[PDB]
Amino acid sequence: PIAQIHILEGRSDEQKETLIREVSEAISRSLDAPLTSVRVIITEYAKGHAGIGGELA
Amino acid sequence: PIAQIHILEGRSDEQKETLIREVSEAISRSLDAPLTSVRVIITEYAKGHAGIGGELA
Amino acid sequence: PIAQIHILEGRSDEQKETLIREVSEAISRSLDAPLTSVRVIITEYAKGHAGIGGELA
Amino acid sequence: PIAQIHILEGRSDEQKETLIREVSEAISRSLDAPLTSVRVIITEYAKGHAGIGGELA
Amino acid sequence: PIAQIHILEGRSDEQKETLIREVSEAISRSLDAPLTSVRVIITEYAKGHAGIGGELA
Amino acid sequence: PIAQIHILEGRSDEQKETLIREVSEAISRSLDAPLTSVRVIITEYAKGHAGIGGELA
Numbered sequence A, B, C, D, E, F: 001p002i003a004q005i006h007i008l009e010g011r012s013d014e015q016k017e018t019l020i021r022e023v024s025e026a027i028s029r030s031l032d033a034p035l036t037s038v039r040v041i042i043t044e045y046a047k048g049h050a051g052i053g054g055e056l057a
Helices: A013-030 B013-030 C013-030 D013-030 E013-030 F013-030
Strands: A002-008 A039-045 A050-052 B002-008 B039-045 B050-052 C002-008 C039-045 C050-052 D002-008 D039-045 D050-052 E002-008 E039-045 E050-052 F002-008 F039-045
Touching: A002 A013, A013 A039, A013 B013, A039 D039, A039 F039, A050 D013, B002 B013, B013 B039, B013 C050, B039 C039, B039 E039, B050 E013, C002 C013, C013 C039, C013 D013, C013 E050, C039 E039, D002 D013, D013 D039, D039 F039, D050 F013, E002 E013, E002 F013, E013 E039, E013 F013, F002 F013, F013 F039
Parallel strands: A002 A039, B002 B039, C002 C039, D002 D039, E002 E039, F002 F039
Antiparallel strands: A002 B002, A050 D039, B039 C050, B050 E039, C002 D002, C039 E050, D050 F039, E002 F002
């Protein structure tokens, strides 16, 4: 299983690796899949690259 | 935050309902973000549509 | 330019034909880009495959 | 609904913000969906990261 | 590395199995990365879910 | 046809130039589609943005 998470940029390296760890675990439990097969890729977006209603985020 | 999770087809609706929730909870936790802003998208793949080494899954 | 649009399933082919045309025009228009270079691909998601707060839509 | 737009880098911040506004509106009309539920995320690609026929763009 | 290939629907399982192997090897080849680390996922699109120039494919 | 390739950063431009050309050709053959219609986009991921076992890559 492969997860691509899209988030707003600005966060520390501290949280984003925890995210990888926390999300990978949730996939493994939910789908009874071995953790070693779970992939997480994070993509960050700049202020001018994210919209919520036609307006910037 | 937006999570697109790619999984092999074969799971029950029950399992996939758990996946969305557990992953959503993990994301809210990891990024101290309000849960109500978290979105999850599941995409299922048939075995003949997924490869691991050039070989099917 | 390539647009991947993620929507809940349930619309008619007509609405999706309108979506492709109207979104394509806006991209060509917004980026002063040739319309003929614009690609749009729609991905529909079943009700049990989309989350908003860890819960279904 | 969630729209992912993949574009070549080099354009100004002014053009990319208009895109979010205009693409969002197009989605809202085409699918008779409330505008505030529409999300847009822009991804730019360096010239050496985009192909049209096996050749760079 | 993860490859997501977006194609028009209508092709045989034979062609898509050929696609996965040939594309995986090309990636493993280009980047001197283990073939066994290569993942490929295919997503097919119906006539009414793909646009070029705002018109259906 | 569109290929989205997700790779870890650190490789040279010549390798990625090879990748786009080489991968584009593989898709064209496999699906007997004109090469000039094949498009490829590469997305690179930093050390802290990729997970494989819940641990960084």
